[PDB]
Amino acid sequence: NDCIFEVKHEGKVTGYACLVGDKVMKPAHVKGTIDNADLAKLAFKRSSKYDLECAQIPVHMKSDASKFTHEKPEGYYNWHHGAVQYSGGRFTIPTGAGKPGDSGRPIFDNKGRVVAIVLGGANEGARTALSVVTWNKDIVTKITPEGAEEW
Amino acid sequence: ASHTTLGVQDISVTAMSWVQKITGGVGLVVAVAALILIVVLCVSFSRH
Amino acid sequence: SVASFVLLSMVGVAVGMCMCARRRCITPYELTPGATVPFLLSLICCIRTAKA
Structure with missing residues (x-):
């Protein structure tokens, strides 16, 4: 289901604008600045x-947001190139x-509230495992397997 | 003068201990700031 | 003059390491959506007033 908050930067999506509650989270690991100038006046903060x-969000686009999210049970989730099976964390x-x-895509959840962003992955030999950032209820952290590439 | 010239910057008064008060005080403020950085350096490099 | 240059530079470097410690602590509590820095750490890193 692609019916979510949307953004692009220098034509690339460049990580989706996660309007998860009162926020404008923008996963731009790579080049880009605001094409979707409907809220151009961002107080940008980063930590590489x-x-x-x-x-x-000030108020202007608050009706575009989802409610808050952090839960991650074992199973499978969905991303822009199909199903993503999740197990062993x-x-x-x-x-x-x-x-x-x-270059930066969500894992949009099964029940309508976002989790994680994909940044890359490793070949296991026949499986492939992702390199990802994720929300831990508090903090934010990275998962990355042995020999991983980034996109 | 029937005596050796002073060390001019070496031999201050016994009551110069103001230099140990300020250099110890600022040295401890630096050591506390260094500890506060070494703590959060160690948490932000143990959260991956 | 050389002693007050080093001693003023030391309260500079001490506040500099305190600033580095503020940023490298607070950023992974400030990035995350729908989240907050916990009450005690909000006081220790000098934001807002009381348990607000």
Whole structure:
């Protein structure tokens, strides 16, 4: 279901604007600045050791937001190239489902409130496992397996 | 003068201990700031 | 003059390490959506008033 809050930067999506409650989280690991100038006046904050950048909604676009989110039980979730099976605390995909140019994409959840962003992955030999940032109820952290590429 | 010239910057008064008060005081403020950084350096490099 | 240059530079570097410690602590509590820095740590890193 792609019926969510939306953004783009220098034509690339460049990580989705996670209007998760009162926020404008913008996962731009790579080049881009605001094409979707409907809220251009961002008070940008960043910390590159968790790759992400962020700001706050004033009121103008608050009707575009989702409610808050952090839960991650075992099972499977959904992303822009199909299903993503999640077990042993990590997301996994069909080998080759992701590629360069998949530069920041959500895992949009099964019940209508976002979790995580994908940034890359490793080939296991026949499985593929993702490199990801995730919300831990408090803090934010990175998951990354042995030998992983980034996109 | 029937005596050796002073060390001019070496031999201050016994009551110069103001220099140990300020250098100890600022040295401890630096050590506390260094500890406060070493603590959150160690948490932000143990949260991956 | 050289002693007051080093001693004024030391309260500079001490506030500099306190600033680095504020930023490298608070950023992973400030980025996360729908989240807050916990009450005690909000006081220790000098934001707002009381338990607000």
